[PDB]
Structures are given as C-alpha cells and as structure tokens.
C-alpha cells in the first residue's frame, strides 16, 4: 500500500482550474480528475453532474459502473 | 437468460421460412435460405451439446479431487 492525498471538498485553485481544464481536455471521466488534481473521486462524480447542467461538458455514454463525458462535442 | 435468446432467434428464422415453404414457391425461400446459412450461428440448425453426467471422485465430470502421497 501507499499514501495518496485527496480532498473531499474544493478550495480556490482546484475549483478555478476545474472550469478551465474542460476545453483543454477531450476526455473527462471522474478517474482522470483523481490524478490531474488531488480530488477524492466521489467529489469528481457530482462535480461533473453540475457541469452538464451548464452544458460545459457533454454526455456521450453512461452506465452503472463507468461514465464518459466529453469537452463540448465540437470540432 | 442467455439460451432463450438463441432459441427465439432460431425459431423466428425458421418460422418465416415455413410460411414461404407452404404458401409461396421454392425460389422465394431458397434465396432466404442462402442468406441465413451464410452467417450460420445455429439459426437453421441446433447444437447437439448438452451436459455430461458426473461420476464419483470429482466435483466435475472430468476434474478430480487432489491426490496426496504424504
């Protein structure tokens, strides 16, 4: 085992980066938010649900055990 | 859940055929036969495979309990 740092709620830099990482990244899953930031992972699940209501991300597929989200579906 | 899916497919394939075999001519259904049997996947045929009967000295039909010499 190991020790990895995580945060269960946001602070400034995480939250502000969260809005601007979106157009920079084509793939968006909660797992990828775990590594690029230090985020719990369950935090990232609900964080993406918020963004989809704004239309800053787009759903592309959904399942019980895995969920995919994309940038804006533009090209 | 699984084997039912193959059963309903196998029946509807043959059902369609039989309707043409009885009320329409040969050359209608001969055509349809060539199409299905091309990607045959047990649509017009049936597996003969069913479970084999277990014999003693194993939990399965082939697999056996462990053997110790000491």
């Amino acid at each position: 085992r190991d020790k990895l740092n995580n945060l269960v709620l946001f602070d400034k830099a995480t939250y502000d980066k969260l809005c601007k990482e979106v157009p920079n990244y084509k793939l968006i899953t909660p797992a990828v938010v775990s590594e690029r930031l230090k985020i719990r992972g369950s935090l990232a699940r609900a964080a993406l649900q918020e963004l989809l209501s704004k239309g800053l991300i787009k759903l592309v597929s959904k399942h019980r055990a895995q969920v995919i989200y994309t940038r804006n579906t533009k090209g | 859940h699984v084997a039912q899916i193959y059963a309903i497919r196998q029946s509807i394939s043959k059902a369609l055929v039989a309707y043409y075999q009885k009320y329409v001519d040969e050359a209608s259904k001969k055509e349809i036969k060539d199409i299905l049997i091309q990607y045959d996947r047990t649509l017009l045929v049936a597996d003969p495979r069913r479970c084999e009967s277990k014999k003693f000295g194993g939990p399965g039909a082939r697999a056996r309990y462990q053997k110790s010499y000491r």
């Binding site: 269960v8 709620l9 946001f10 602070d11 | -």
Partner: protein, 145 residues
C-alpha cells in the same frame, strides 16, 4: 466550498470530518453502522454529507438522541444490553464504559468460578471449539538424541 472545519473531538474518541456522517460515528465503540443509520434519522438530519459539515447545535442533539434511546422511541431489542444482569434495566453502553462493563462480567465469572472464568484465566476458547489444531503463537518441538 464549505471550508469551515474538519477533524474534531467528541466523547472518548476523535472523529474525523473527512468521512461521511454515519460511517464516521462508528469508530466510537458500542456503535456499529446499523446503530447509526437509525439514530441519524431519529435526529432528522442528512447522512448524505460529511461529518465536518455538522454544526455544534446539531451534534449536541446527536449524543442526547443516542444516550436516551428508549425515550426517543428506538426499540428495546435494538439495544446492546437488555437487563444487563443485576442492574435491572435495558441499557446502551458507549466507548469507555463498555470496557468497564466488560471487565466486570469476566471478574464475576471467576468470582463464582464457573467453567467460563477458568477458560478466560487460562487463555483458552470460551465457546465450543477445538483447540487441538487451533491456535499457535508456539510449534518449536524436537525429539532426538
């Protein structure tokens, strides 16, 4: 958001604000996960957020709803103890009192000196179990010359 507080101390055990409310509370002895999802609902609060997001007003109510469970209409069968024995009532025991209570019942069964206390004092299994192939701490045995 919600940067207000994190790790805190409550009665007899330190409880983190890192974890969800119900599961956080379980660390305190005499409270399992099953016991906590009840007590939160009698308190009529969310269990869908962290323990660091509770206020002092709220957690003050929690311990009251916990330590008088019969008076907030949690059934008798759902308690740890029903008629302790020689105390005459239904009871619910929590962290540091649990150990004190436990050590009494050990002492009692060597006081009378039943089969129980002897097995306890010898360090052998209380319940019907074989000890022939069960245990080991020990195994270094030799016999040659």
């Amino acid at each position: 958001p919600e940067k207000f507080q994190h790790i805190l101390r409550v009665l007899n055990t330190n409880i983190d604000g890192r974890r969800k409310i119900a599961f956080a509370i379980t660390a305190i002895k005499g409270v399992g996960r099953r016991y906590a999802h009840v007590v939160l609902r009698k308190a009529d609060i969310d269990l869908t957020k962290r323990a660091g997001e509770l206020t002092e007003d709220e957690v003050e109510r929690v311990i009251t709803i916990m330590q008088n469970p019969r008076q907030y209409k949690i059934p008798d069968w759902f308690l740890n103890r029903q008629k302790d024995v020689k105390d005459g009532k239904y009871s619910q025991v929590l962290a540091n009192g649990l150990d004190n209570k436990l050590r009494e019942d050990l002492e009692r069964l060597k006081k009378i000196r039943a089969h129980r206390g002897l097995r306890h004092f010898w360090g052998l299994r209380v319940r019907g179990q074989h000890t022939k192939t069960t245990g080991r701490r020990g195994r270094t045995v030799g016999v040659s010359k």
